[PDB]
Design a protein around this ligand. Sequence first.
Ligand SMILES: *[C@@H]1O[C@H](CO)[C@@H](O[C@@H]2O[C@H](CO)[C@@H](O[C@@H]3O[C@H](CO)[C@@H](O)[C@H](O)[C@@H]3O)[C@H](O)[C@H]2NC(C)=O)[C@H](O)[C@H]1NC(C)=O
Ligand SMILES: *[C@@H]1O[C@H](CO)[C@@H](O[C@@H]2O[C@H](CO)[C@@H](O)[C@H](O)[C@H]2NC(C)=O)[C@H](O)[C@H]1NC(C)=O
Ligand code: NI
Length: 418
Amino acid sequence: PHQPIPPSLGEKDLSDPFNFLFSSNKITLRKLYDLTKNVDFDQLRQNECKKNITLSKFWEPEDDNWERFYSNIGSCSVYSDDQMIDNLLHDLNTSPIKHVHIMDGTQVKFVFTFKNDKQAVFKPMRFGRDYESDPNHFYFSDFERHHAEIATFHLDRVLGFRRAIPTVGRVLNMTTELFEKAEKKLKKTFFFSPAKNFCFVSRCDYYCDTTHAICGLPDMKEGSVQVFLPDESAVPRKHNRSPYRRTYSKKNQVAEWQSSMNYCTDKVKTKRQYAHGRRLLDLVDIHILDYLIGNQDRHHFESFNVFNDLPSYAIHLDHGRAFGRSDFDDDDIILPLRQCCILRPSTFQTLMNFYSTPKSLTKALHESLSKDPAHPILAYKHYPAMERRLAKIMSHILECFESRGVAEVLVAEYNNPD
Ligand SMILES: *[C@@H]1O[C@H](CO)[C@@H](O[C@@H]2O[C@H](CO)[C@@H](O[C@@H]3O[C@H](CO)[C@@H](O)[C@H](O)[C@@H]3O)[C@H](O)[C@H]2NC(C)=O)[C@H](O)[C@H]1NC(C)=O
Ligand SMILES: *[C@@H]1O[C@H](CO)[C@@H](O[C@@H]2O[C@H](CO)[C@@H](O)[C@H](O)[C@H]2NC(C)=O)[C@H](O)[C@H]1NC(C)=O
Ligand code: NI
């Protein structure tokens, strides 16, 4: 089947997810050690977050973990309590579904309304875990992968960012939980395939048609379930165009930042929004994440606009187009690191910690992913890829240290003299 069963409902893979050879370059490792042996990271880290305040203390409800999640949304992090979040994850997976609606407007996605009247974003599973993106497909031609949404959220926690939105796997009964709970406009788009599998077309801009319908085998369908952001009326949000937006054209495929090396220096560091603050450090952080997962589709940034005065941060969202290729690293994604050569001190330590112990990153990720009910989330072939990409990142960092000095790269806040 092109659209297979949920892997959790299949034969359990007994293979060792880490039976691959890697090893770490000790020359590079030693050069990073030497260039940083006198850096007091502890004192450096304390300025990365100006004021650590949650949404509740700023307001001065916890009936359910949604409200408990919303309340603990901080000024320098989306969440800081893994256990409470893991409880929310459990709720997203197990809570009874009351309504299913087609979401605004993009690829097929549903809004789940649970019995507690809380809500979530649902993205259905299409292909199996082994499926890789067409080499001829552009980033804007790529089909979303629900398991990429899940995997990246976990990786975002493992890296210690916690600026991603809680997402869990869930195997749904298409008949009782989708069809019978669906709105009238969505319900009518359901049908049976020639193989008698249950299918829905839905309505959306990107290939919500009969040919690309989502189909069960016959009536179950795994998907990603992501907790809704708090209401915009209460917690307003900002939508910002990325300076590293790609061209999104097959004729002119080369943006300025892809051909001009000094792009960051002349065109990004000199902008008001990036000249002072945390925004550029965020951009480097999020592109490190996107490079590790091979996400090319980072055209805009999303941020809360609710904490007065204090600086906002980019919400790590929209990861559907991640993990498309296990045999290809797109170094264009990590270009901001190479061009800007600034890096949040905590991020460096996190990366350094994982890098100095081979396979520790993917092992810590595997362990996190294992708690998801829909595991395995990622095909194991992506693990050596992530290790390979991590090593390459450290090489770019070493180049930044040697070219611009460690005191100019590792800053908790960026300030442009000019
Ligand atoms: C900003 O301030 C908040 C306010 O406390 C910080 O949150 C606390 O961070 C610690 C350290 O990660 C959390 O501790 C952990 O709790 C789990 C669950 O019990 C435990 O297994 C771990 O061993 C660890 O003790 C703590 O839960 C968390 N508090 C809350 C209410 O979430 C936050 O770390 C500060 N920094 C940032 C960037 O937000
Ligand atoms: C999904 O839920 C449906 C319930 O609607 C399950 O199908 C039912 O199976 C029983 C078994 O005897 C029948 O009596 C019902 O008539 C069936 N329902 C319908 C609407 O035909 C189905 O088995 C469930 N599938 C999974 C994978 O859980
Ligand atoms: Ni097609």
